[PDB]
Design a protein around this ligand. Structure first.
Ligand SMILES: CON(C)Cc1ccc(O)c2c1C[C@H]1C[C@H]3[C@H](N(C)C)C(O)=C(C(N)=O)C(=O)[C@@]3(O)C(O)=C1C2=O
Ligand SMILES: [Mg+2]
Ligand SMILES: [Mg+2]
Ligand SMILES: [Mg+2]
Ligand SMILES: [Mg+2]
Ligand SMILES: [Mg+2]
Ligand SMILES: [Mg+2]
Ligand SMILES: [Mg+2]
Ligand SMILES: [Mg+2]
Ligand SMILES: [Mg+2]
Ligand SMILES: [Mg+2]
Ligand SMILES: [Mg+2]
Ligand SMILES: [Mg+2]
Ligand SMILES: [Mg+2]
Ligand SMILES: [Mg+2]
Ligand SMILES: [Mg+2]
Ligand SMILES: [Mg+2]
Ligand SMILES: [Mg+2]
Ligand SMILES: [Mg+2]
Ligand SMILES: [Mg+2]
Ligand SMILES: [Mg+2]
Ligand SMILES: [Mg+2]
Ligand SMILES: [Mg+2]
Ligand SMILES: [Mg+2]
Ligand SMILES: [Mg+2]
Ligand SMILES: [Mg+2]
Ligand SMILES: [Mg+2]
Ligand SMILES: [Mg+2]
Ligand SMILES: [Mg+2]
Ligand SMILES: [Mg+2]
Ligand SMILES: [Mg+2]
Ligand SMILES: [Mg+2]
Ligand SMILES: [Mg+2]
Ligand SMILES: [Mg+2]
Ligand SMILES: [Mg+2]
Ligand SMILES: [Mg+2]
Ligand SMILES: [Mg+2]
Ligand SMILES: [Mg+2]
Ligand SMILES: [Mg+2]
Ligand SMILES: [Mg+2]
Ligand SMILES: [Mg+2]
Lengths: 155, 206
RNA sequence: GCGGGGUGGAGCAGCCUGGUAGCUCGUCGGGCUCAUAACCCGAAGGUCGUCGGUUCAAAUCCGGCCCCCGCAACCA
RNA sequence: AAAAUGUUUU
RNA sequence: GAGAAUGGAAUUCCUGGUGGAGCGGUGGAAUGCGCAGAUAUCAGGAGGAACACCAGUGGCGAAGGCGGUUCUCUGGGCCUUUCCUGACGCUGAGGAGCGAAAGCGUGGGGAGCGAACAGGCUUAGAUACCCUGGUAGUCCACGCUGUAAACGGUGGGUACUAGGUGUGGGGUCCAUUCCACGGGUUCCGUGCCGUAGCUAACGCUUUAAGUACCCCGCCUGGGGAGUACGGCCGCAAGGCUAAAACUCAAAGGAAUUGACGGGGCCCCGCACAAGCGGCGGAGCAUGCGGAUUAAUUCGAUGCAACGCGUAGAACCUUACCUGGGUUUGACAUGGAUCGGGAGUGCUCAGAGAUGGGUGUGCCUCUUGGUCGGUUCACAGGUGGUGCAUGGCUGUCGUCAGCUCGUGUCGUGAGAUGUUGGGUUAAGUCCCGCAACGAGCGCAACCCUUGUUCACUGUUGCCAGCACGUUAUGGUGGGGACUCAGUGGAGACCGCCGGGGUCAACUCGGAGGAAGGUGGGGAUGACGUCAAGUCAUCAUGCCCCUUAUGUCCAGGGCUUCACGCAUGCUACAAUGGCUGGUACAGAGAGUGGCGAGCCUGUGAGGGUGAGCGAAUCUCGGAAAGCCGGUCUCAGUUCGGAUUGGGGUCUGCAACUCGACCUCAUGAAGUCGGAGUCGCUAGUAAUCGCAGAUCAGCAACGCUGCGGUGAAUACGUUCCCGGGGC
RNA sequence: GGCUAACUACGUGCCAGCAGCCGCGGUGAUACGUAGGGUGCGAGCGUUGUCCGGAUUUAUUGGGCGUAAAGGGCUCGUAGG
């Protein structure tokens, strides 16, 4: 807004796994205002993760988030009579938000039956380095590199 | 066009209701008789000049306070007119009416009578500017802290309608603790009717 | 006489040969606008001048006819 | 970056 | 100023070397050029034109104008004490000459630039802007033309009338020098500020647009028109001189205040952006346009009409249509006049209105209440005009503004206050200030919510005490807790620290339930839109009066090739079905809310307590959790449509009600261009209650709580607005 | 209607018409038409034409030319002043 940066609500931690990441994940799933449904989905996905690999589900979620985190992304610019795609570096909070949003959206887009282990499959694939989320991260980075010539328009 | 009634705005806060009775199975019919009483009194006692009609009820007995500038018309000769109006009131309602008529200490300060007089002058075809200035000057001679008069309509018998107004002093319409008396009347002329609104800032109340 | 042309509302493609009738504009319905024009998104629109023949099948092939063009209609 | 127009009430 | 020679850089072209894929150009591109070697790069050469820096705040010229250097020729200006002539001065019609650039003639030259032109782009078109090319021309010589916003839009000469302060030129004086730095002073320029004065104002003001005198040019409303005719000039283009008819009642100058700007600076709002969920597609509900109809009553029409007047159209409502009745009328008020019943029960005819029967028939009193006719007055109108109005409302807009008194400035409209700096959500304050003040707006006072205290204790509550049918605060009882509802307390940048010239404010911290306005509502300034409403009411005028009044039955307002708008249910697995099991708030109720039991598959029916309600009832909250099941299927998704059987309300559910049940099982696979809402207990979703209401087309509206997010770097862009 | 002394009703409804200029008439017309009333004049009263005035709007008395119409593009110079 014009007035200034609005305050941010503090992020709570998940009672079970003790990480703000899982709370952010459930709040991102969180369709229709059904917190209990969303975190049932999230807990089921994390338990499926620890079932298929011995490593900790919170650690595998973290690894997936780092594999989906974008470093820079392009935004539209109205310089002159044509629009430009100016690449801009992404702050850690913004990139965590982008990673979570992409993870959730592509989990919803996956072909498997149930959301819980659609999200589980997507998390495992991202942690390994595969999947639609990682593909989108690579594509956005590729397009930022293609339009890298406009790094001097940053303000 | 977009201003609230001052009396309704301050109702319950500073000013009080004109009717004081309680009934929960007859409420509508008591409202109807009250409407009949007020319409009858207004239609048949224009000459006296009615500031307010205040209605109370105890048990099938109605009490009417008539705040009038000149209760000479209401009382007639030795209370004959008072008796006849009371009798018409029993005829209209069917209940025991106890009617008492009260003065207004400063008719030049009560807004309703001020609108009464301004509308009467307009009907008698007095220049509206002169009438408004006279009412304003009289109000401030009495000692009101603020006057505001607005006459809207075919002022001076013209074709287009105007909204001419006068004011000086202070009339804080937005202040609830401000004691603002509001009056309105309609001058019935050969050219429709003129709406005269008067706000009078009596002072500040708790 | 010789040669060409006639296809949605208009102007133009589809004709060696048969089977799938296209582009532009306009018409109509919806956006954009205060409103119109412009622009944006969707749709309808010609059984092919007419008669007859060929052929399983004709806008297409063949003939007659109607309309529009061009050319020719010359030598004393 | 170019991006037009605004009949006749009484 | 004229002539001649001549200097260097840069562009272009040429030749050569090198080197290789683009170059160029724009808002973006393309035309164009380039492997036949461009662009680039280096060397050499040719040619034309203009002269960076010096260089402006400056110099010169009668004006137009004048910038490389050198030489030749030449014009004018300025100063000076002596010197000379002795009014020889000034201006100047006609006339003559000079006169930017473009243009014309003959010849020359031609690098760059560049009308015309060609092409590319943009565009609805683009005979343009922009791009690539490019001829006259630009250059030279000699002529011609003779016009410019040729402007200081200000003719020349002269004298006088405060200053202040830059700068160009010539003298002269002074001190230290025995230069020059410096100061003065004088004469002539050239700017700026500014007094008197002048001007309609803007402004001018010793360089006058001041005060005066001399001479010249010129003006007499705007167009027609600097045009026609004639004449002169010219090679031509054209120039000069210069009307009239006709037509308009203005044309115009400066300035003021507004609005607007594809003007600036500074700001703000879910205005973008960042996000989440939608609408536009499907079915249905609802409003409207259109069409239709005997009627589809009327109003609303960009935002600010379209789930709007309607918080309830089967009759009624109802204003519309067909038809049937009625005429002082369906209803008022007042005079008379004949009266005693009025008013009604049962019946008859009728679709009903209504009409005919039959029963019943005033209270006072000798003159009232009540009705009757005949009239008489009169009523009646949702008939017209919202552009005759009042009232009420929308709206810009919760936007931060809009004005006044006095003073002052200006001839005046008008200005100042109300500009400026800082700040604020705020014309909120602070600082300065020809302003000093005040008013309506902002804020606060009000309601609600968040903490807490006192008081009261039922119909509310149950910590300690005594029983209760096992059981229910059921019981005696209790003021503890909760709550109910009255009255208080509490927040004020008040405290601490920093910033802030200080000052307003601002940042941080403590305390605290709450901190910088804590959240929300009520509240809508001066005015705008001839905004809406004559249909809520009221009303000016006009219109109807055996009809535009009024009564009634039936019909219509519910039509349907279509279009728009607001919603609802969806398209499924974060889901459907099924069993179990938790947690609300706010409300309503006597023709009402109805428990319990019985009956039915169910809507419901039959009985039927209780409660005018902190008591009784509506009552079940739903989402959620837990178990089972379905397994991605146009489905065990979706529930449209259609067939059957019903229930209830109502005089009456055909047109045209809701609901139950059985069967049927449509489109719909997440929706084109476009578009909407929202910044936190919000969006999203989940149920509940109320108004109107016999019933209900309610999925609407107004509220209520449950669950409960993501995101806001930021102001560049879109929309609206605010100050200057 | 104002200049300009003297106003109302009825009829009409941008029609009929009025006007010297400004303008009037679109349903309340002091501006049209009529009537009552009024005003100015009066054996006259209006209209038209023409002239002067107002017009300092050709300014000798008595105007102007920065931006309102108006300084010649500039100078030289003849008559003249
Ligand atoms: C037609 O008669 N003459 C010619 C003028 C006129 C005369 C009397 C009236 O009473 C009205 C009008 C014009 C209309 C125009 C209406 C229109 N509207 C209906 C959409 C409109 O475009 C707006 C608006 N958007 O603002 C309006 O102003 C409006 O509503 C309005 O006020 C009107 C009137 O009532
Ligand atoms: Mg021959
Ligand atoms: Mg020469
Ligand atoms: Mg320079
Ligand atoms: Mg200069
Ligand atoms: Mg001598
Ligand atoms: Mg000459
Ligand atoms: Mg030239
Ligand atoms: Mg030439
Ligand atoms: Mg030549
Ligand atoms: Mg060009
Ligand atoms: Mg010049
Ligand atoms: Mg001139
Ligand atoms: Mg001269
Ligand atoms: Mg002079
Ligand atoms: Mg000087
Ligand atoms: Mg002058
Ligand atoms: Mg000429
Ligand atoms: Mg001007
Ligand atoms: Mg957005
Ligand atoms: Mg739809
Ligand atoms: Mg309608
Ligand atoms: Mg109407
Ligand atoms: Mg209006
Ligand atoms: Mg209307
Ligand atoms: Mg307030
Ligand atoms: Mg209107
Ligand atoms: Mg009416
Ligand atoms: Mg309807
Ligand atoms: Mg009650
Ligand atoms: Mg907000
Ligand atoms: Mg007079
Ligand atoms: Mg009349
Ligand atoms: Mg004269
Ligand atoms: Mg004259
Ligand atoms: Mg003059
Ligand atoms: Mg002069
Ligand atoms: Mg001029
Ligand atoms: Mg001159
Ligand atoms: Mg000349
Ligand atoms: Mg002489």
């Amino acid at each position: 807004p014009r007035k200034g940066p609005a305050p941010k609500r503090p992020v709570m931690v998940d009672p079970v796994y003790g990480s703000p990441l899982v709370s952010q994940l459930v709040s991102k799933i969180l369709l229709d205002g059904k917190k209990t449904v969303a975190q049932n989905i999230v807990y089921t996905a994390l338990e499926g993760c620890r079932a298929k690999n011995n490593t900790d589900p919170v650690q595998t979620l973290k690894r997936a988030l780092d594999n989906i985190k974008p470093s820079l992304e392009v935004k539209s610019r109205r310089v002159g009579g044509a629009t430009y795609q100016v690449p801009v570096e992404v702050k850690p909070a913004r990139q965590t938000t982008l990673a979570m949003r992409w993870l959730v959206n592509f989990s919803r887009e996956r072909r498997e039956k149930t959301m819980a282990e659609r999200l589980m499959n997507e998390i495992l694939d991202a942690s390994n380095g595969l999947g639609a989320s990682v593909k989108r991260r690579e594509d956005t980075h590729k397009m930022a590199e293609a339009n890298r010539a406009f790094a001097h328009y940053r303000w | 066009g977009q201003k609230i009634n001052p009396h309704g705005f301050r109702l319950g806060v500073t000013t009080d209701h004109k009717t004081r009775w309680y009934a929960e199975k007859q409420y509508a019919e008591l409202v109807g008789e009250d409407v009949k009483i007020r319409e009858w009194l207004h239609k048949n006692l224009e000459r006296a000049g009615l500031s307010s009609i205040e209605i109370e009820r105890r048990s099938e007995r109605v009490t009417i306070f008539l705040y009038a500038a000149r209760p000479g018309i209401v009382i007639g000769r030795n209370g004959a007119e008072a008796e006849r109006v009371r009798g018409e009131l029993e005829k209209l309602t069917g209940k025991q009416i106890q009617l008492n008529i009260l003065e207004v200490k400063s008719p030049e300060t009560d807004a309703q009578l001020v609108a009464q007089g301004i509308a009467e002058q307009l009907a008698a075809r007095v220049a509206f500017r002169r009438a408004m200035r006279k009412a304003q000057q009289s109000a401030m001679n009495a000692g009101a802290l603020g006057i505001r008069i607005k006459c809207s309509g075919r002022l001076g018998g013209a074709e287009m309608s105007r909204s001419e107004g006068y004011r000086e002093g202070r009339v804080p319409l937005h202040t609830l603790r401000a004691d603002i008396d509001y009056g309105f009347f309609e001058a019935r002329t050969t050219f429709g009717r003129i709406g005269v609104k008067v706000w009078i800032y009596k002072g500040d109340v708790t």
